[PDB]
Amino acid sequence: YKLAVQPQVNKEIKNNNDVDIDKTLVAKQSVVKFQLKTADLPAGRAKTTSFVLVDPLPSGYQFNLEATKAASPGFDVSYDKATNTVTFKATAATLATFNADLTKSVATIYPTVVGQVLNDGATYKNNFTLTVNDAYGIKSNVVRVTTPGKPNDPDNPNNNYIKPTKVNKNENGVVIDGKTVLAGSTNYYELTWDLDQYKNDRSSADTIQKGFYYVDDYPEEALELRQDLVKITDANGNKVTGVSVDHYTSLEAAPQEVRDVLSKAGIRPKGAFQIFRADNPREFYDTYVKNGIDLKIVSPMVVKKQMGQTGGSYENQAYQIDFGNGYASNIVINNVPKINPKKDVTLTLDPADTNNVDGQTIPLNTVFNYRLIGGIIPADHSEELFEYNFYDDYDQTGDRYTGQYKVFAKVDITLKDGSVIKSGTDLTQHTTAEVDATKGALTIKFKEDFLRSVSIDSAFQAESYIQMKRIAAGTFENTYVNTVNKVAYASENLYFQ
Numbered sequence: 001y002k003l004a005v006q007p008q009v010n011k012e013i014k015n016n017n018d019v020d021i022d023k024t025l026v027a028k029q030s031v032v033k034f035q036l037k038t039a040d041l042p043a044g045r046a047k048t049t050s051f052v053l054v055d056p057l058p059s060g061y062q063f064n065l066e067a068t069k070a071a072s073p074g075f076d077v078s079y080d081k082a083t084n085t086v087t088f089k090a091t092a093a094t095l096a097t098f099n100a101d102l103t104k105s106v107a108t109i110y111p112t113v114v115g116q117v118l119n120d121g122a123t124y125k126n127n128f129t130l131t132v133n134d135a136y137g138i139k140s141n142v143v144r145v146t147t148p149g150k151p152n153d154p155d156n157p158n159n160n161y162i163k164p165t166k167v168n169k170n171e172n173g174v175v176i177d178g179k180t181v182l183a184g185s186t187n188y189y190e191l192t193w194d195l196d197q198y199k200n201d202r203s204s205a206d207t208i209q210k211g212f213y214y215v216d217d218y219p220e221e222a223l224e225l226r227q228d229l230v231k232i233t234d235a236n237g238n239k240v241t242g243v244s245v246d247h248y249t250s251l252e253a254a255p256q257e258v259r260d261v262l263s264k265a266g267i268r269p270k271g272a273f274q275i276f277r278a279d280n281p282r283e284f285y286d287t288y289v290k291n292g293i294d295l296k297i298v299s300p301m302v303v304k305k306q307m308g309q310t311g312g313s314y315e316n317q318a319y320q321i322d323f324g325n326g327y328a329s330n331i332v333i334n335n336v337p338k339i340n341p342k343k344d345v346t347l348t349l350d351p352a353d354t355n356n357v358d359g360q361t362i363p364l365n366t367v368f369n370y371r372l373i374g375g376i377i378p379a380d381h382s383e384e385l386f387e388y389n390f391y392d393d394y395d396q397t398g399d400r401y402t403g404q405y406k407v408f409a410k411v412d413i414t415l416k417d418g419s420v421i422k423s424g425t426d427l428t429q430h431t432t433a434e435v436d437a438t439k440g441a442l443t444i445k446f447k448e449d450f451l452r453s454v455s456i457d458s459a460f461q462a463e464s465y466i467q468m469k470r471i472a473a474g475t476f477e478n479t480y481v482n483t484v485n486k487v488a489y490a491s492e493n494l495y496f497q
């Protein structure tokens, strides 16, 4: 009875619900099992003294020793860390079994490797080598599976990168990334939920139950959310149903569920964030994920007033979390301009006049002007200009309004039709004035049609001279406020003292 057994060998690869996944697509951190099966040992074999299955596991597959042993009864399991290689030896019991009756066939048992796939866009190939009686052995077939995240994949023609994307826009739908945005304007952010690569996924139940989320780490120091304008649409153009919207002031403030999901995925937001959520993972998965249908989230956010006084930049970033795996969007930067309106006293109406600083004391009965310098509105800005007003509340004890004002361009203003209004040009014709002589105050209002004719790509600044007569001795306060696009901005003296 010489001639040791020479069974055929079949390696099999399965997900955590014991479904075959050979040559498919499975999500990152999926549990992936390998079964090292052998054919039945034939009647008239020799005594099997040793039956060892060596399996050098693929790069990026993380071996779970305890689970493996749990799944591989009748086998001693040993693992070399250096080489990521598991070895199974049939125990004395299993060999007693193979040898009990050499005159009749016997079924083998098999060891199962339990582990997870750690990396995105990767192909994981596996085989194993039986050797019998510390002599002859044989290498198995090759099985494999792929994680989504990689283009030109032969097994999954839809596989591309997982890239959630973010873009900023004005209400016309024009791209406003990188541009100046005036306090009160809204950022009509469009977040993409990138699912197309997940098409024909074959992950287990346990993996899908880890859920689907989307985070917008908005800058709460600069923006407040218009939550009521959010519009989740699929890539076929349809409304999206199962996703709920929440916002939270900080990570510490938000439920145990969300802290966990963000913590697991490795996402720690800066202060406040907006978070979307698949209400039923399974349904979401079955409708959009498995079908490779990108989502679109429109999440508009308005710029706080309090930011026009400081100015400075803000940035928005998004994250998608599929099966508990975290991916970052591109970062979109905008900046708010400091609107810095200035007030001076001058004896002339000449916009090019000498820039004297001298403590301007106005002799009794002198005709003078308050020079009300408007805020600088920088080139390449969000929305159209539609309001630009100079309010001026004067003290009637000391100052009498003459009924005469003029307005001047203070920088080169470019209109839409391409014509350019040079700095210094009289713009008075494009204004009117609200006067209340009784209260002691007036507002010079640029005309809406004229402002809306200013290119959004042009800088804009004007100044008003309002003519007064000083009618008493003593010194006299004067208040001026410049209002742009419905946002008030206090003036300071042009010369600090």
Ligand SMILES: [Ca+2]
Residues within 6 Å of the ligand: 160, 161, 162, 163, 194, 195, 196, 197
């Ligand atoms: Ca993609």
Ligand SMILES: [Ca+2]
Residues within 6 Å of the ligand: 217, 218, 219, 220, 269, 270, 271, 272, 273
């Ligand atoms: Ca934030």
